[PDB]
Symmetry: D7
Subunit: 122 residues, 14 copies
């Protein structure tokens, strides 16, 4: 039932990214966040320092989160797997859609949920 | 308890490389979800989906290598592992090749033994 | 007689899309509309939220609807299958035509017809 | 409860196709079945006559080893006698060159209950 | 004698098209004109509505009609088959020629000849 | 009522072609049949002589299994003795390499009634050539 | 009346070529035959010696001669222009068609017609 | 002696074309001139109407400098009033981009003497089209 | 404890390069530095003279140093191997990441550490 | 004088590889050898386990070692950088040459020299 | 009259080449023959030694010599320029034609004509 | 001694071409000059009329900066009045895009002495 | 006397990079032969041929580097040098590029000063 | 005049290579021969050890040596520059020609000439 708890937090995180609000992002991510993602060229990154770059140095877009499946593991742990559709407008003016498969693992540290691990493909 | 996970992950990969489906099923939760290249960007209820790859054939020589395994522990019963899998093998044309995958496995302890509940693989299968 | 009813509604829906009238679109679509379409990269979308983007953020064209075949199923259900030819003018100035195969499933909710499912293949 | 009814029938239909059991297929399809599908080159076909060809001239798809998977089946129900299903079909198979491959189709099947049993009246396949 | 009648009408129709005179075109075409043509992507079109677009949204050219063969069928029916060579000047300034094979089926409705079907390839 | 008459004759003609029955074909075609078709490279042919070749050189070497389908046949009638049909021909067949393929042609056939039976006087085909042997 | 004379001779010449009957060919060609043709790489050839090669070193085919136009010039001279469609069967087993545009100039030497010049494109 | 007569007339015809003098061209061509040529896409044209287009649409916008050369003209004579010429036409010109280019055509012209002057009744061109404007 | 010493010096060297501070670079490099690197077309260069050019004739970037492994060899010698991820912004405006595998061999000459040899493979950064 | 010591050991190591003598290789390599190399897809490998595969599963060839430059660092440490030309004969029968740039770092453990780190760029040999 | 003399000798030389008769070739070529030709990669060769290779280490063909133009220069000198069409049969079985432009310069040494220089461009 | 005579005349001819001096060219060429060259598309041309075009319509090749080089000129002499020269012509120039380029031609020129001065009667250029 | 040659070779390359043709001519024998890419595989009497490259334009920034110069000496008056020339420069598009040439220069001492009599260059000009 | 001395030795060296006679090759080459050549990938090689491979592990061919230019430098030194044309027969059966530009520097060590340096491009 409180699977919807996770989905909301995931949605809030993606919202922060799309806004370039790094302070908002950091709040929701654990400081020791590990990340597999295309931009890391097949490396695992201690992904708080690595992600700053994309905020500090950066159009209309709409993110959609399909078939979010949440595994719950006792009081303080859960993981979410979901397809992220991103509608945007290419420089050449045309509208385009792009798909990513995303896995976010969540730990509740004192009341709030934290994202500790992130795996993105696409 | 981190070394506990790595061992189980290693045991799972061993089962896959052997085609021992019974061994695989033991270590995977029955409701295992999976993102992987062979699923064309879909999430699969990955016990039924994986059978096919076992039923239809270490025969060839291969060496799996697991680099920089990082394990997050979350209370008594939960942990997730992220690691690069290098796979040395021999192509049909006879040459030796290496392929890299980035893998994320999320683990739940159900009564003593660890179960794999979610799997995310990107790169080469 | 009631087959021509569907075709008209389908035509009205396409008209709303070509006009960018989202209010008009929403009226004719069920709020729980599911959609398979090229712009969704082979995924099923809960297609009211997904479609807003194309209205809110967006030339001479003529839509043509060939060989509309309608299956009727009791008082309150019908589905339509039709080829959509779209004549338009490319940026380079030339006139082009593009074909889509479209399936729309309709439910009558209280007097008016609602589009509950949409399947589009070929060109957007 | 009646949504799971449709999924089962859809599954039974796909089973018939993979087996090359045309008699089984015909039972589940309405005789006036319309179809959009890749093999019809963007045309709507009165798809009972059109589909026979693939049964009569091709060894069962299950002759070769294959596993069909049906993801996120969403069913709209419309009163007693009408329903439509939309689903992604993953098909695991083995190419002639010996390698294993997976292929995706997006499928829409519209169903009418004629006297107890469900009938497939329309089919839309893309991929 | 009545074969030359058709050729003239066909010539008049092509003249209307090359002029963008839609009123002139409609007069010569039956209102229920069916058409196979490249611009219809292998579909049959109820080709009065479909053709408007090319008039409403649109230089020196010379049409040539080779080996027109006309079949006559009683008082009120005939069909013509002919190669249409079109000499024109491309945007890049060069002169170009293009070939089409055309079939027009004619019905005499009330004095005048009407084009009821059109098949164009090239 | 008389439109279904044409469709049947068109169907019978295509049947003759798919069987390699040239006698059956000739019966249904006027002897002065003109034809535009892909195999004629954009030329009009006095298409009784030109068509023989595709019959005479379809042997048992080249008897693949095939199924023709005729979509949205639209028939224009013109007085007692004249009519024209326009239709899409889908042809399901099996390539030499063993795979099944489908090909589309757009076809226009103009018909003259000579004494009871219908005759094909003109033929226009665009897209894929779909004679057994092609 | 004398136009049909030429067409027949042209047909007889093409027949000789399709049969590989060089003796039959030579009879109908003037011994000083000039030829433009694809196989001559844009050169004019004294085309009796040049043509032998194709006979001495060489299945079902049907030649068709479209819209033969014949110019007659007094008792002893005429030229024919015609499209040659050739239906044949490629080595890979498929049936193919090929088009050539042909011009043959004829001189009546002593009863029989002789081909003095030949121009082939395609 | 009478062979050089033809070559001169052929040269005069090509001169008329390169000048865009259609009146001069028509004088030298029979009014029933037939033509095979690249610009006709493998069709025979009643080539007086078809050729006008290339004259009428060659303006001062399109007066490049060009030099025609006629190689190995071979002339067959056939009684008093008939002859045919076969020759390679090299055309030196200057492309729009400013560079100089050369193009080759193989040409066959059949001639009829009508009362003193020679008339061109048939024309066969293969290779590059070399009218000023192409 | 003395491994973290090397990582810091390596980090300081990369910092100098990204700043175009050649004086700072020279301080940390031995004057007889040898170098294998993409820009040298498979040659070993006496890499103090060769490197000047890139400073004298030269946007936002972030270097990341993954899994630095340090071998120590007695008091005065150590070598470091590490993956260098470089986030930058191409001229066309897009953000790009590029990977290099780097080996730096260090000699302690009187208190301070000196870089005597450098091996770079992948993308020049 | 002690530079020629290293070159000889490097030569002996390459000899062992070209012979498929894994025992001979292991003797000369430290058991904790780290390696950057083409076959490792830009990863650092704990390169004793990773290298076995190429021995266990494996024509005329001639290795040539150009401009070996050796840095010495006190009693027990040294590094060598050199270009390796490898003349061989492809399966298609033709003779081919391939170039690698190689860096080997050496530690003297009790009398004998050990290879502790290896960096190879260009062609795998 | 003496132009036809050259053409015959040129024809005899080409005949010798097509037969692989090197003795016959050498007789007609000056011993100091220079040659530009495709097989020499844009170099001038002292072309008696260079040509041996093609005889010693080597199908139906017909050579044709178009529009041979001969310049005569006093008693003992002449040059010939001609297009050589070569009809042959490719390995794949099809018949092919290839064109070369050829220049041969001739010196009469004591009664017989000798080829002293050869320039070939296009296809070998 | 008389071989160096030819090379000089050949050099003078090339000089005339690079300058666009047609009068100078005509003096050195026989009026019946035959020519094989790339610009003639594999045809032999009566190359006095054919060559005018390149002078009358093109700024001197020496308008742009170029250096011609003549490698390994080999001359066959044949009695008092006849000789032929074969040589590689390297041409250094500057492309429109600003870069410097070199291009190679293989050239054969046959010479006849008519009354004191040498005349070029035949020319073969490849490249 | 080997270092004598290297200096003269360096002086010659300096003259070329400066466009000082007078300086070049002094150091080259007047009968200098040359194989080089710009000559399309021909040997050139390379004093006249080279003028063109001087007359028609260090303006742009470049750094030449001369690796592993090997000098053969042959009695009092003869020597030949073989060396790799790395040239760092900046392409028109603004990027920095490096190009390699292999160069052979043969030297004759004519009365006190050294003269370059033959030059062979392969790779990039 | 004794330029021909060098050319002969160069010819003898190439002969040894084409025969695979390594003993004959070694005699004519100085033991410290340096070499730039395509097979060395832009490196200078101490080219006695490097060259063995091509002898120990290896059709009709004819080498031609064009415009050999020899610089002489006192009693004991000379260098030769020459184009080497190689006529051979490819595996596919066709005859091919290939060009190399070669520079060989020669030192007379006690009576016989030795090749001390070699530069090959092509």
């Amino acid at each position: 039932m409180r699977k919807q708890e996770i989905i909301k937090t995931t949605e809030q995180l993606i919202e922060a990214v799309n806004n370039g609000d790094f302070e908002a992002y950091a709040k929701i991510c654990d400081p020791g966040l590990t990340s597999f993602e295309p931009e890391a060229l097949g490396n695992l990154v201690e992904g708080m320092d690595f992600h700053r770059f994309y905020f500090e140095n950066l159009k209309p877009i709409h993110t959609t989160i399909l078939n979010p499946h949440v595994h719950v593991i006792g009081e303080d742990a859960a993981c979410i797997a979901y397809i992220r559709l991103t509608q945007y407008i290419d420089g050449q003016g045309r509208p385009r859609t792009s798909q990513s498969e995303e896995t976010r693992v969540w730990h509740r540290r004192d009341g709030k949920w934290q994202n500790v691990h992130f795996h993105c493909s696409g």
